Enzyme design. Structure first.
Site, PDB file in Angstrom:
ATOM      1  N   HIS A 150      14.837  22.868 -36.550  1.00  0.00           N
ATOM      2  CA  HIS A 150      15.752  23.933 -36.006  1.00  0.00           C
ATOM      3  C   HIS A 150      16.982  23.856 -36.364  1.00  0.00           C
ATOM      4  O   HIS A 150      18.065  24.829 -36.198  1.00  0.00           O
ATOM      5  CB  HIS A 150      15.641  24.150 -34.403  1.00  0.00           C
ATOM      6  CG  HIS A 150      14.244  24.673 -34.215  1.00  0.00           C
ATOM      7  ND1 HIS A 150      13.725  25.979 -34.761  1.00  0.00           N
ATOM      8  CD2 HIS A 150      13.135  24.565 -33.333  1.00  0.00           C
ATOM      9  CE1 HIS A 150      12.554  26.291 -34.090  1.00  0.00           C
ATOM     10  NE2 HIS A 150      12.170  25.500 -33.241  1.00  0.00           N
ATOM     11  N   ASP A 183       4.860  22.462 -37.893  1.00  0.00           N
ATOM     12  CA  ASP A 183       5.050  22.839 -36.488  1.00  0.00           C
ATOM     13  C   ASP A 183       4.860  24.202 -36.173  1.00  0.00           C
ATOM     14  O   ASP A 183       5.105  25.267 -37.085  1.00  0.00           O
ATOM     15  CB  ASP A 183       6.626  22.505 -36.253  1.00  0.00           C
ATOM     16  CG  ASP A 183       7.124  22.498 -34.956  1.00  0.00           C
ATOM     17  OD1 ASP A 183       7.039  23.445 -34.294  1.00  0.00           O
ATOM     18  OD2 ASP A 183       7.378  21.376 -34.409  1.00  0.00           O
ATOM     19  N   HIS A 237       6.220  26.332 -34.656  1.00  0.00           N
ATOM     20  CA  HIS A 237       7.569  27.101 -34.637  1.00  0.00           C
ATOM     21  C   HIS A 237       8.194  27.417 -35.904  1.00  0.00           C
ATOM     22  O   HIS A 237       8.108  26.129 -36.571  1.00  0.00           O
ATOM     23  CB  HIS A 237       8.901  26.755 -33.717  1.00  0.00           C
ATOM     24  CG  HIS A 237       8.173  26.377 -32.184  1.00  0.00           C
ATOM     25  ND1 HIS A 237       7.783  25.260 -31.849  1.00  0.00           N
ATOM     26  CD2 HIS A 237       7.960  27.485 -31.148  1.00  0.00           C
ATOM     27  CE1 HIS A 237       7.270  25.656 -30.683  1.00  0.00           C
ATOM     28  NE2 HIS A 237       7.397  26.704 -30.038  1.00  0.00           N
ATOM     29  N   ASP A 253       2.811  20.775 -32.175  1.00  0.00           N
ATOM     30  CA  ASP A 253       2.626  21.680 -30.945  1.00  0.00           C
ATOM     31  C   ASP A 253       1.422  22.934 -31.335  1.00  0.00           C
ATOM     32  O   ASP A 253       1.388  23.758 -30.666  1.00  0.00           O
ATOM     33  CB  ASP A 253       4.018  22.429 -30.919  1.00  0.00           C
ATOM     34  CG  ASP A 253       4.873  22.396 -31.844  1.00  0.00           C
ATOM     35  OD1 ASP A 253       4.353  22.356 -32.992  1.00  0.00           O
ATOM     36  OD2 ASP A 253       6.187  22.527 -31.808  1.00  0.00           O
TER      37      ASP A 253
HETATM   38  O1  LIG Z   1       8.815  22.640 -30.783  1.00  0.00           O
HETATM   39  C1  LIG Z   1      10.024  23.331 -30.634  1.00  0.00           C
HETATM   40  N1  LIG Z   1      10.422  23.575 -32.025  1.00  0.00           N
HETATM   41  O2  LIG Z   1       9.749  23.130 -32.952  1.00  0.00           O
HETATM   42  C2  LIG Z   1      10.519  23.739 -29.498  1.00  0.00           C
HETATM   43  C3  LIG Z   1      12.094  24.438 -29.864  1.00  0.00           C
HETATM   44  C4  LIG Z   1      12.839  24.753 -28.499  1.00  0.00           C
HETATM   45  C5  LIG Z   1      11.898  25.749 -27.791  1.00  0.00           C
HETATM   46  C6  LIG Z   1      10.722  25.177 -27.390  1.00  0.00           C
HETATM   47  C7  LIG Z   1       9.830  24.819 -28.357  1.00  0.00           C
HETATM   48  K   LIG Z   2       6.495  25.989 -38.826  1.00  0.00           K
HETATM   49 ZN   LIG Z   3       7.772  23.222 -32.328  1.00  0.00          ZN
END
Ligand SMILES: O=C(NO)C1CCCCC1
Ligand SMILES: [K+]
Ligand SMILES: [Zn+2]
Ligand SMILES: [K+]
Length: 356
Positions: A132, A170, A172, A263
């Site tokens: 991120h 992942d 996200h 996750d």
């Molecule tokens: O696993 C994550 N990103 O990959 C987290 C990022 C912040 C918000 C909760 C989930």
């Molecule tokens: K991803």
């Molecule tokens: Zn994640």
């Protein structure tokens, strides 16, 4: 030979106000313990951790962002809380900067061991995560984009145009990794992520399938967005068969980096998906057919300590050459998953003849 890097100093990064925050120090210690428990650790060659240098961080990050996080090392709790709340979903302690440096440097040494032939592949049990993190800001438990940095580091010790595939499974979207390489054709970014029409974190339509890259990087950014609830092994196996593997084989990467968040796993408190440890094993086993097996698995998210420990251990078992475990009977794909896969196929068939 399979490399493994783990340094408990990365547990020092902690949440001073919420000791039960899901991005726990014991995430990496539980994964390490499960490797030892399954007798996988002694089958690996231990790769040491190291601090990334500020010049190495500059491969992907602005000087301003580097200096802000660096300055947090000497901050009091009041300054730390205020600075963390300046970002989207960030907590900071005086050890956070050092641990992010260790996460990056651990992967630099691991990529160096792979590219020099010391090991065939490797696994990096590191925290805090990275995917991120943007060029100029931290986000979503991430300070520096470890996977992106490792791709640039890999190129710096080989040739500038080294073909690096980053697979981000992942749950996200790796908004930072996409943005960093969005105009780059030497780094192919492929992300599978829960999207829900933009409602799922990081809550941006940048994660939709129609974002294929920009400029020279057009066609080198592949978003596989999931909509409509729970997905699992049948959906991920199909996405790999129809999209990830044919695109990856055509790109012909010389190094494969896995942003391996766990996750999307069954039991995760945030993902809401049901990918099994056997599923992650098969995904790993398929990526091993690329780049002459030069694969580096980098821990990202994943917050059920039992789920991530079993899941990542099964990945390392695949890297070590063990035969894939048996998947359950793969149910028919959820209809929304076929729509998603078809949308990505239509978006990327112009750039990848293997999809036609
Ligand atoms: O696993 C994550 N990103 O990959 C987290 C990022 C912040 C918000 C909760 C989930
Ligand atoms: K991803
Ligand atoms: Zn994640
Ligand atoms: K790209």
């Amino acid at each position: 030979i399979t490399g493994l890097v783990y340094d408990q100093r990365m547990m020092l990064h902690h949440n001073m106000w919420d000791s039960h925050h899901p991005e726990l120090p014991q995430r990496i210690s539980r994964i390490f313990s499960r490797h030892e428990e399954l007798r996988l650790l002694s089958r690996c060659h231990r790769i040491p951790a190291r601090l990334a240098t500020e010049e190495e961080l500059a491969l992907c990050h602005s000087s301003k962002h580097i200096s802000i996080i660096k300055s947090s090392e000497h901050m009091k709790p009041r300054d730390l809380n205020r600075l963390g709340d300046e970002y989207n979903s960030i907590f900071i302690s005086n050890e956070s900067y050092t641990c992010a440096l260790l996460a990056a440097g651990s992967c630099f040494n691991s990529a160096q061991a792979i590219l020099t032939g010391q090991v065939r592949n490797a696994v990096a049990i590191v925290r805090p995560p990275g995917h991120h993190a943007e060029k100029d800001t931290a986000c979503g438990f991430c300070f520096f984009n470890t996977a992106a940095l490792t791709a640039r580091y890999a190129q710096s010790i080989t040739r500038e145009s080294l073909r690096v595939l980053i697979v981000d499974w992942d749950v996200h979207h790796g908004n930072g990794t996409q943005h960093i390489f969005e105009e780059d054709d030497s780094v192919l970014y492929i992300s599978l992520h829960r999207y829900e029409d933009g409602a799922f974190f990081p809550n941006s339509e940048d994660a939709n399938y129609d974002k294929v890259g920009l400029g020279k990087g057009r066609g080198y950014n592949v978003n596989i967005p999931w909509n409509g609830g729970k997905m699992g092994d049948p959906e991920y196996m199909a996405a790999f068969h129809h999209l990830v593997m044919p695109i990856a084989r055509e790109f012909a990467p010389e190094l494969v980096l896995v942003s391996a968040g766990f996750d999307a796993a069954r039991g995760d408190p945030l993902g809401g998906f049901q990918v099994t440890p056997e599923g992650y094993a098969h995904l790993t086993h398929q990526l091993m057919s690329l780049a002459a097996g030069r694969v580096l698995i980098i821990l990202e998210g994943g917050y059920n300590l039992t789920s991530i420990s079993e899941s990542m251990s099964m990945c390392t078992s695949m890297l070590l050459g063990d035969s894939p475990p048996s998947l359950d009977h793969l149910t028919p794909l959820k209809t929304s998953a076929t729509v998603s896969i078809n949308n990505v196929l239509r978006a990327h068939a112009p750039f990848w003849s293997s999809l036609r």
